[PDB]
Design a protein around this ligand. Structure first.
Ligand SMILES: Nc1ncnc2c1ncn2[C@@H]1O[C@H](COP(=O)(O)OP(=O)(O)OP(=O)(O)O)[C@@H](O)[C@H]1O
Ligand SMILES: [Mg+2]
Length: 253
C-alpha cells in the first residue's frame, strides 16, 4: 500500500523549548507555514537553498521534529535515503536487503539502480564483502537499500551524489519514475528535469515555501525566477545549489 501526505500550515522549531512556547502561544523556526498535499503514488520534488529546511522537512515526517503549529497526516512505514551515503561492513546483498530476502524485488532494485554490472565484476557477486567502493557505487547501494525496503512512503534526500549526468538521468527514470511509479515519494533534488517530471514541487528558502505547485505553474507564476534556472542540469551539484541559493536570496518574499 501507499499513503497520502498532507501538511497544512506547519511551523517547527528544532529547539524544543521554543517549539513549546510557540505552540502554547495560542528564535526562528526551521520551517514556517508549510503546505502541501501529495496523493497516493505521487512524486513530490523538494528543492531549495542551502539550509532552507529540506532535510528537516523529511525529519518532521519521520517524527524526529515535531510541529508547533499545523497538521501533518500520513500513515504506514517510511523508508529514508540520507544525503550522505553509508555502507555497513558486510556483503552488497546484506547492505541492500538487511535480513529479509525477496528475490524478485531484490533483482528489480539492483537492475533499476544499475548494480548488475557492479555485482557481476566480482567472483563472489553480491556476496562480496564491503573491497572499497567509489562514491557512485556507494550512492547506488544506499538508494537500493531505501527502495528495497517495503514501505508506504519513500523519502529520498539528494540520493544521486557522485553519479555521472547520464547515469543519474537513467536511474531517475528507471528507479524513481518507473520502479517506484506507484509509491508515494518525496525527492530532494536540484535538477530542473526532476522538478519537471514531479507531480508537485516545493521550493524552500530560509524555512519558508517560496513556491508550491506544478513545474508549469512555476514557469508561469515565477517567470523571473525560472529565467535563471531554465544548461543548468549539466552544472555540478555544488554549482546548481549555489545558483539556486543565490537566485532564491534575490527573489524571496
Ligand atoms: N537535529 C537538528 N537540530 C538542530 N538544528 C538542526 C538539526 N538538523 C538541522 N538543523 C539546522 O536547521 C537548518 C536547516 O538544515 P537542513 O539540514 O534541514 O537544511 P537543508 O535544506 O537540508 O540544507 P542542505 O542543502 O545543506 O542539505 C540548518 O541551520 C541546520 O543547522
Ligand atoms: Mg539536507
Amino acid at each position: 500500500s501507499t499513503t497520502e501526505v498532507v501538511m497544512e500550515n506547519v511551523t517547527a522549531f528544532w529547539e524544543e523549548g521554543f517549539g513549546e512556547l510557540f505552540e502554547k502561544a495560542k528564535g526562528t523556526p526551521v520551517l514556517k507555514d508549510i503546505n502541501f498535499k501529495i496523493e497516493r503514488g505521487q512524486l513530490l520534488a523538494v528543492a531549495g537553498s542551502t539550509g532552507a529546511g529540506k532535510t528537516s522537512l523529511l525529519m518532521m515526517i519521520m517524527g524526529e521534529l515535531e510541529p508547533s503549529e499545523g497538521k501533518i497526516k500520513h500513515s504506514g512505514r517510511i523508508s529514508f535515503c540520507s544525503q550522505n551515503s553509508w555502507i555497513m561492513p558486510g556483503t552488497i546483498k546484506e547492505n541492500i536487503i538487511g535480513v529479509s530476502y525477496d528475490e524478485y524485488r531484490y533483482r528489480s532494485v539492483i537492475k533499476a539502480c544499475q548494480l548488475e554490472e557492479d555485482i557481476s565484476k566480482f567472483a563472489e557477486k553480491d556476496n562480496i564483502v564491503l573491497i572499497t567502493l567509489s562514491g557512485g557505487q556507494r550512492a547506488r547501494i544506499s538508494l537500493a537499500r531505501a527502495v528495497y525496503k517495503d514501505a508506504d512512503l519513500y523519502l529520498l534526500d539528494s540520493p544521486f551524489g557522485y553519479l555521472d549526468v547520464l547515469t543519474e538521468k537513467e536511474i531517475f527514470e528507471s528507479c524513481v519514475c518507473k520502479l517506484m511509479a506507484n509509491k508515494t515519494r518525496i525527492l530532494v533534488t536540484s535538477k530542473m528535469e526532476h522538478l519537471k517530471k514531479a507531480d508537485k514541487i516545493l521550493i524552500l528558502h530560509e524555512g519558508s515555501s517560496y513556491f508550491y505547485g506544478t513545474f508549469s505553474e512555476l514557469q508561469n507564476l515565477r517567470p523571473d525566477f525560472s529565467s535563471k534556472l531554465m544548461s543548468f542540469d549539466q552544472f555540478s551539484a555544488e554549482r546548481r545549489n549555489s545558483i539556486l541559493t543565490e537566485t532564491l536570496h534575490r527573489f524571496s518574499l
